[PDB]
Structure formats: structure tokens, C-alpha cells
Ligand binder design. Structure first.
Ligand SMILES: Cc1cc2nc3c(=O)[nH]c(=O)nc-3n(C[C@H](O)[C@H](O)[C@H](O)COP(=O)(O)OP(=O)(O)OC[C@H]3O[C@@H](n4cnc5c(N)ncnc54)[C@H](O)[C@@H]3O)c2cc1C
Length: 403
């Protein structure tokens, strides 16, 4: 009923690939056409601040489009507009695509820093393979890099650059790192780790401008750098949706079926503003797991309307040198339980966030084994014995089973 052929998807990132693979796997055999503005074989972004930044082989980061047979991928083509009455999409190459169902999977773009508009020194953001190549081409040993923003991507780049023998300074407007999506205990530990690896961290500082290779701060001081990478967050790529009259606010509003306010138009991944089931509030979720899992859920329900809506709880990971960080659910509740010691000597620990005895979030540092059972406990809103949660004798995989 809702799934009308032909299917057109705008964007060829993870959300798009995951969606079209699930359409095919679920048994939809109609036309699928995907429009991607990047002239690149679809690829995954997490490597760009990690192993790619370090080793430079793009053929290790391509998405597997095997589970998406009989898809026409229009790469290097921009969707300029769509007409939701005519059920058409206008492309940059002069062609028009008809659709029965239109899927907006256009992701998000790094926010520019207004105070570095008209900088006369290298200022980059890190989103694309082209961005990663341009940054890597300036990552010379004993270079000076300034990162603006203490989000996970800036910190992943900081670790990669330090490992490469690059001097790194980092300016954060907040009093802590990872203010978006991380428990304070984690953010404090992570700052201690980066400081110990030689990152020059500047907290509660904002950039006010730049002059001849030097960045100016709002404490009236200067940081000289060979290169600036700005990581102050992203803005949804929701321009086509806004122009066509869909409900958007830095992100296209969708329900759990991926429906926008425009009939026959859906949206998925980083472009969307959606319900976080743990907070009960709408948020733009900026994670790999959301892009994949939302794309799959929306495709499954299009093919099989008896399937449930998207229901997965949020989580991400970050690889920052010696720290393999995993974070699920909410950053805080009324209670944090710490398993293990929080120590720079062989870091290994777990945080559990509870709200009235109920697990609402969890963090693992170098403890992948405990993250899977904690996500299962989170998913059913488990209320375990807080003494047991704290006790390192406790086996979390066992608790997961018991419930
Ligand atoms: C450097 C980096 C590291 C990351 N590391 C992690 C990590 O460790 N863990 C984690 O959970 N998440 C991580 N993420 C986040 C994760 O990669 C994103 O959540 C994910 O890429 C979102 O996928 P998407 O398909 O919704 O959007 P995107 O990947 O942005 O894909 C959308 C595509 O649509 C294109 N597009 C936009 N407008 C148009 C148009 N008009 N016409 C055609 N094409 C268009 C875009 O240019 C883009 O190619 C990282 C992201 C980056 C950039």
C-alpha cells in the first residue's frame, strides 16, 4: 500500500545502502535508483578519523552493496529539488526521476566556524573521503594542528595525529570534552588520557578570528597552527525537504516508520530528527548504528506493514588511541555505578547509568565483552541489584540471560 514503485533514494551513504539492501532482502523486486552527490563507491565514514587517516587505503572502507542487487547508483549527481505533487526529482545532470516512494538519506554536513570565514590559513572539516585525504596531505610529523571542538571525531583525529608525530592543540567552548553524548566521568577520564599523550587542551575557550597563520581566542590569546580542523558538529542536509514543504528543524521530522509530513516521502539516518525512546524527546541521532538500523527498520516496514516501527536504543563507539570507547543510552540518570578502576594504567572500566533503579545508559572502555549484555539490559529497562552491578564478581552476560 505505502510501498509504491519505483523507489528513489537521495544520498548514497550508510543509511541509503542499508535501506536498499533491506528492501531487496525483504523481497521488493521493483526499481530502485540511488542518487549520490559524491563521485565515490559508497564508503563508511568511521575509518576516516581512524585507520584510513593512519594508512590511506580507500579500498578497505567501501560499503558492501552485495545485499543490494539490481540497484542503479547515480554517483557524482546532486538532487536539486523534488516535486511531491508530480512525484519527480530534478538532478544536476539535467535528468528527472519519477518516484512512487522517495527516501531522503542525505545525512549532515560539518558546521562552519563563522569567525574563521576568510581565514588565510588551511581550515578543513572532516566528513568525506576527500576531506580525509586533504587533512592527511598536511599531517606532516612536527606539524602543528589545532582542532576546534572536543567531540569524538576531533578526539579521534587528535589521537591519530599524535600517533603520526603531529603536535595537537584542541579548543573546546564547554568545560568538558564530548559534551553531546557522554557521561561526565568518561569525559573527565578522556581529557586526562589526551593530556597524558601530549594534546594541549583548552577548555571554556572560543575562536574569535585568525591572522597570518595564528588563531585568536576569546581569552585574548593566540595559537599558531599549520592547519585548523573544525569539529563543532554537523547540520542536517535538509534543504530539499525544506524547499518542498516538509516539516524540518535542522533535520527532517520522522516518525518510527520513517514518514515525513509529505505523503510518499520518507527520511532516514543523520538527516532525521526522531524520537529517542529513552528520553521520550525528538533528537538528531548522529550515529553509525542509527543510520544502519533506522534504514533497515524503515525498509522492512515498507515491504511488510505488519513489521514494527524503528525501536532500537541509541549507541556509538569511538577509537581514541589506546581507548576503545563504547557508549549506549543516556549520559546520566540519578545514579552512576563504576565497575573497575578509572586509571591511565591499562584503562579498563564500565559505567552504568540508572534512573530509579532502571538501567538507562552504559559505557565500556576497553571492555567490549560487557557492552553487549549491558545493551540487552538497557533494551528491556532492567532493574538489577545495584550491589551486584558494582561487585566485579558479577558476570553481566549472566544477568542479561536471567532477564
Ligand atoms: C570522520 C567520521 C567518523 C565517524 N566515526 C563514527 C564512529 O566511530 N561511530 C559512530 O557511531 N559514528 C561515527 N560517525 C558517524 C556516522 O558515520 C554517521 O552517523 C553516518 O555516516 C550517517 O550516515 P547517513 O547515510 O545518514 O549520512 P551520510 O553518510 O552523510 O550520507 C549522505 C550522503 O548523501 C549525500 N547528499 C547530500 N545531499 C545530497 C543531494 N542533494 N543529492 C545527492 N546526494 C546528496 C551526502 O553528500 C552524502 O554522501 C562518524 C562520522 C564521520 C564523518
Amino acid at each position: 500500500e505505502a510501498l509504491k514503485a519505483p523507489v528513489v533514494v537521495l544520498g548514497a551513504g550508510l543509511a541509503s545502502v542499508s535501506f536498499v539492501a533491506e528492501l531487496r532482502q525483504a523481497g521488493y523486486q521493483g526499481l530502485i535508483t540511488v542518487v549520490g552527490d559524491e563521485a565515490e563507491r559508497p564508503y563508511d565514514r568511521p575509518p576516516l578519523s581512524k585507520d584510513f587517516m593512519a594508512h590511506g587505503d580507500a579500498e578497505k572502507i567501501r560499503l558492501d552493496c552485495k545485499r543490494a542487487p539490481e540497484v542503479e547508483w547515480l554517483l557524482g549527481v546532486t538532487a536539486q529539488s523534488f516535486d511531491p505533487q508530480a512525484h519527480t526529482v530534478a538532478l544536476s545532470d539535467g535528468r528527472t526521476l519519477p518516484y512512487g516512494t522517495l527516501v531522503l538519506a542525505t545525512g549532515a554536513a560539518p558546521r562552519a566556524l563563522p569567525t574563521l570565514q576568510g581565514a588565510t590559513m588551511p581550515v578543513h572539516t572532516l566528513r568525506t573521503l576527500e576531506d580525509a585525504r586533504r587533512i592527511q596531505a598536511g599531517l606532516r610529523p612536527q606539524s602543528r594542528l589545532l582542532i576546534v571542538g572536543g567531540g569524538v571525531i576531533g578526539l579521534e583525529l587528535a589521537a591519530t595525529a599524535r600517533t603520526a608525530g603531529v603536535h595537537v592543540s584542541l579548543v573546546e567552548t564547554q568545560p568538558r570534552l564530548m559534551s553531546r553524548a557522554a557521561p561526565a566521568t568518561l569525559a573527565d577520564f578522556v581529557a586526562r588520557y589526551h593530556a597524558a599523550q601530549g594534546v594541549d587542551l583548552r577548555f571554556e575557550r572560543s575562536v574569535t578570528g585568525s591572522v597570518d597563520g595564528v588563531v585568536l581566542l576569546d581569552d585574548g590569546t593566540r595559537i599558531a597552527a599549520d592547519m585548523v580542523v573544525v569539529g563543532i558538529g554537523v547540520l542536517a542536509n535538509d534543504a530539499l525537504a525544506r524547499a518542498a514543504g516538509l516539516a524540518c528543524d535542522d533535520g527532517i521530522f520522522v516518525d518510527a516508520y520513517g514518514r515525513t509530513t509529505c505523503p510518499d516521502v520518507y527520511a532516514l539516518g543523520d538527516v532525521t530528527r526522531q524520537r529517542n525512546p529513552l528520553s521520550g524527546r525528538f533528537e538528531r541521532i548522529e550515529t553509525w548504528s542509527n543510520a544502519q538500523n533506522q534504514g533497515i527498520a524503515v525498509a522492512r516496514h515498507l515491504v511488510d506493514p505488519t513489521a514494527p516501527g524503528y525501536a532500537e536504543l541509541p549507541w556509538y563507539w569511538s577509537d581514541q588511541g589506546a581507548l576503545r570507547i563504547q557508549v549506549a543510552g543516556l549520559a546520566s540518570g540519578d545514579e552512576e555505578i563504576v565497575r573497575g578502576e578509572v586509571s591511565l594504567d591499562a584503562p579498563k572500566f564500565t559505567l552504568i547509568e540508572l534512573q530509579k533503579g532502571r538501567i538507562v545508559g552504559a559505557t565500556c572502555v576497553n571492555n567490549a565483552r560487557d557492552f553487549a549484555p549491558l545493551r540487552r539490559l538497557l533494551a528491556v529497562g532492567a532493574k538489577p541489584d545495584r550491589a551486584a552491578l558494582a561487585d566485579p564478581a558479577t558476570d553481566l552476560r549472566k544477568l542479561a540471560a536471567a532477564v
